[PDB]
Design a protein around this ligand. Structure first.
Ligand SMILES: COC(=O)C1=C(CN2CC(F)(F)C[C@H]2C(=O)O)NC(c2nccs2)=N[C@@]1(C)c1ccc(F)cc1
Ligand SMILES: COC(=O)C1=C(CN2CC(F)(F)C[C@H]2C(=O)O)NC(c2nccs2)=N[C@@]1(C)c1ccc(F)cc1
Ligand SMILES: COC(=O)C1=C(CN2CC(F)(F)C[C@H]2C(=O)O)NC(c2nccs2)=N[C@@]1(C)c1ccc(F)cc1
Ligand SMILES: COC(=O)C1=C(CN2CC(F)(F)C[C@H]2C(=O)O)NC(c2nccs2)=N[C@@]1(C)c1ccc(F)cc1
Ligand SMILES: COC(=O)C1=C(CN2CC(F)(F)C[C@H]2C(=O)O)NC(c2nccs2)=N[C@@]1(C)c1ccc(F)cc1
Ligand SMILES: COC(=O)C1=C(CN2CC(F)(F)C[C@H]2C(=O)O)NC(c2nccs2)=N[C@@]1(C)c1ccc(F)cc1
Ligand SMILES: COC(=O)C1=C(CN2CC(F)(F)C[C@H]2C(=O)O)NC(c2nccs2)=N[C@@]1(C)c1ccc(F)cc1
Ligand SMILES: [Cl-]
Lengths: 150, 143, 148, 143, 150, 143
């Protein structure tokens, strides 16, 4: 099976990968923001939206990954091996979940169409030589609805 | 935050806990069954349903967990240590995903109300002394 | 005072005693089932029914008994004596609570008349020689108002 | 499961625990009084009331605890050991049942509203410095 | 800034000082009583009254004072001395909070006017020589021509 | 009892916790600001507002805490142990009172809704990577 978690939301893994890793907040800061803005909906008995359903699973999945990675660290006897697991998590699944958590949080706040336009706008800006581009980054909020019955 | 992945679907972690671990198919068999029955919908650009959205994420999350567990597992020198990872996965996160994958697959096939009733029916049957209960288990599809 | 806990529910200790101890689920499984089926009602501020009121007390009483039995076991010097406490609890008060919890859970699920008939049906079946009786046991399944 | 035995009766464990242990009659005296006032109803085939149903179970539960504690005591050779069991029962589960038996007996005699008001009145009186408060305690039957 | 916590409630520190320390229940007993009588209101999202707002803060402030003293005691010296040195909280600020907690609880129960008059009545009684005064203290809760206008 | 001092004002401890500690002025600067802006109201015989009542108690509570912390500090002139008192205050109760004093002062000046929106705006801004966000912080007074 070949499932792209962005495809039902009108995006792709390749489109999120257009952004450099430095664009994304940390996982902990994304999780804090999801709580600050959406805790009640995420904890509610209501689906709310496909974005809420996906964001719930992504939050819990990161917890699963951290529980496994922590248990692995607990059994490692070499301090350099423990560093290897951390660096493996941060370099691989960490970036994947920063992309994913950011995508759902930003879509819930600003809308898919605005988010996809911002992804392109920032990705083009950061690829322009710094001496040739505007000094500040484009701003997500400065950019210019199905009811999901079941 | 305290998110119960079953709550938006009318269930709870505690309710799935009512079933013994032996009730659930293996993760591999659950994944094979999701593919055999729902591959086209799971891979489509349509949400289809909240169960599809959740099942998509659970399938991908298990992939993430297995890539990590395999990467650790292939690099261990002691077979007692590899048995420790396998036994840790099977006893903990493996059981969580058997519950979760089974819940979404069964709901996609039979509907929430049938699944919740079956959860209780089987959990009650298996707790009845074997000499006092019907020889065969209750059947999910019947009702 | 001589109170039979079944009497207000149309039964007696002697009638529950007609069933062999192997008939009843374990206490842990009865408690799990009470939660799976009746957690919200048992925890609610409403009486719900006389069975709910009695089942609430039985659940908490089992907790009291286990706290006492656990405390006794930890403080006994002789480990063989600790084993005897466990076996004494299981053979005596444990069986009493399996009967009691089963009675209220079954009554809430199937009603008093079905339960009382089933207790006699199973009690008669298990006393029939196995070679002379049906191979499978009888099946139990095959908001009320409460007067006094 | 988290069951508060007072909740269906409009009270809580925390409210009963507002009263110091010395407020409550002994378990033996509560059982004597339950018999003197309510023996026929408690032994009858009728529910009578939710308080009667709960009080029946509380009386029998204390019997279970005493049967267990007595069996333990008869099997302990050391008197100091038997003394500690007696003191443990009275200090812990004994207080729980003094609260519980008193609550049901008082409610059957005076009604829940009167009982709850009295709990607060006595709990406030006993917390007032003795030199600053009325010499006698408030009276349950008044008002 | 010189804030008297009683001034907005029609009293002063000097007036509460008229009562001897023996008059007041203990802090623990005042806190137990606030819960027994006012837990739901104190925990609610409604202001309820100025007395409720002030009492909420006093309860939490006592917690702050005890948390600090306990944390220091846990990391001061070995336990032989650490507990009794920080029993200063009870020795000084303990009376201040007994006054303050009692003031808010009594006002919520009986009203400011009854409380202030009772403060004076008890303070006068306790200052009268015991051999010359009534044996029992005045009572906080205390105080037929309605037939004519029948 | 579980009292959240923000709850009657439409907030929670966890919401204030969304802000980094560096966001808040010092306690001393919050107190000097409360005096410059609200000394007369805070010292008046009128309630003025629920925020005034709460802020009065918080100001006085900090006085209680510092008298205690100084008495604790003055007793043992061992630098490590002394530096633990100030470091415990700075990391724990000092931060609690910076949050609380700021919340009441900002609410008195700009209103609850402006304050709550600003908390989220700044908390989100500071979590955006510095190279990707506007160079200056959002401004509390700008609606
Ligand atoms: C809600 O409980 C029930 O419904 C029960 C059923 C439901 N039955 C379970 C079964 F598999 F045997 C078939 C089914 C039926 O009667 O159709 N059966 C029984 C018993 N049967 C024989 C000895 S105890 N007890 C409970 C009350 C029971 C209570 C607690 C427990 F853990 C197990 C069973
Ligand atoms: C699409 O899935 C199903 O339909 C399933 C059926 C369908 N049933 C399989 C059966 F042979 F037991 C009879 C049939 C029925 O109820 O008529 N049964 C079950 C379970 N039954 C007992 C424990 S798990 N799970 C799934 C969801 C299930 C899911 C994944 C898997 F690998 C196996 C079963
Ligand atoms: C394993 O042994 C026991 O269970 C027992 C021992 C073990 N004792 C040690 C021994 F080996 F010398 C034989 C026996 C004895 O004193 O005769 N002693 C007793 C006593 N009853 C009255 C006075 S002592 N009861 C139990 C059954 C007893 C039962 C429950 C309990 F909690 C404590 C003791
Ligand atoms: C709700 O609190 C009260 O009602 C109180 C009463 C109620 N009175 C208790 C009494 F027994 F003395 C008689 C009764 C009355 O006035 O009729 N009395 C008092 C005090 N009286 C003297 C010194 S403190 N304080 C509180 C506020 C009080 C507050 C907390 C506490 F723990 C004890 C008393
Ligand atoms: C039937 O029970 C009662 O009526 C009771 C009365 C009746 N009062 C006994 C009295 F002497 F104090 C006067 C009388 C009254 O209120 O007029 N009082 C009390 C208590 N009062 C204070 C602490 S417990 N409990 C019971 C429920 C009570 C229950 C069991 C028991 F053993 C003792 C008291
Ligand atoms: C609710 O989230 C947002 O509103 C977000 C904003 C809001 N913007 C933050 C800002 F300071 F850069 C200005 C403001 C705006 O667009 O006006 N911006 C961004 C990003 N911008 C650049 C790289 S990520 N992400 C989130 C979804 C974001 C998500 C989580 C997180 F922790 C930080 C930011
Ligand atoms: C009355 O207090 C205020 O008005 C405040 C202003 C007023 N702002 C100060 C400024 F220079 F940043 C611009 C101005 C504005 O929003 O236009 N800003 C802030 C904060 N801003 C960011 C972190 S705290 N807090 C207070 C409540 C504040 C409270 C106490 C204190 F000491 C400093 C600031
Ligand atoms: Cl794809």
């Amino acid at each position: 099976m070949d499932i792209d978690p962005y495809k039902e939301f009108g995006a792709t893994v390749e489109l999120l990968s257009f952004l450099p890793s430095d664009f994304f907040p940390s996982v902990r800061d994304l999780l804090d923001t999801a709580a600050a803005l959406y805790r009640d909906a995420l904890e509610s008995p209501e689906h709310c939206s496909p974005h809420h359903t996906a964001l719930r699973q992504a939050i819990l999945c990161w917890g699963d990954l951290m529980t496994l990675a922590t248990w692995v660290g607990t059994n490692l006897e070499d301090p350099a091996s423990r560093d290897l697991v951390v660096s493996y998590v941060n370099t691989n699944v960490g970036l994947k979940f920063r992309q994913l958590l950011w995508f759902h949080i930003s879509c819930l706040t600003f809308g898919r169409e605005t988010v996809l336009e911002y992804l392109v706008s920032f990705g083009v800006w950061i690829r322009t030589p710094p001496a040739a581009r505007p000094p500040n980054a484009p701003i997500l909020s400065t950019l210019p609805e199905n009811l999901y019955f079941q």
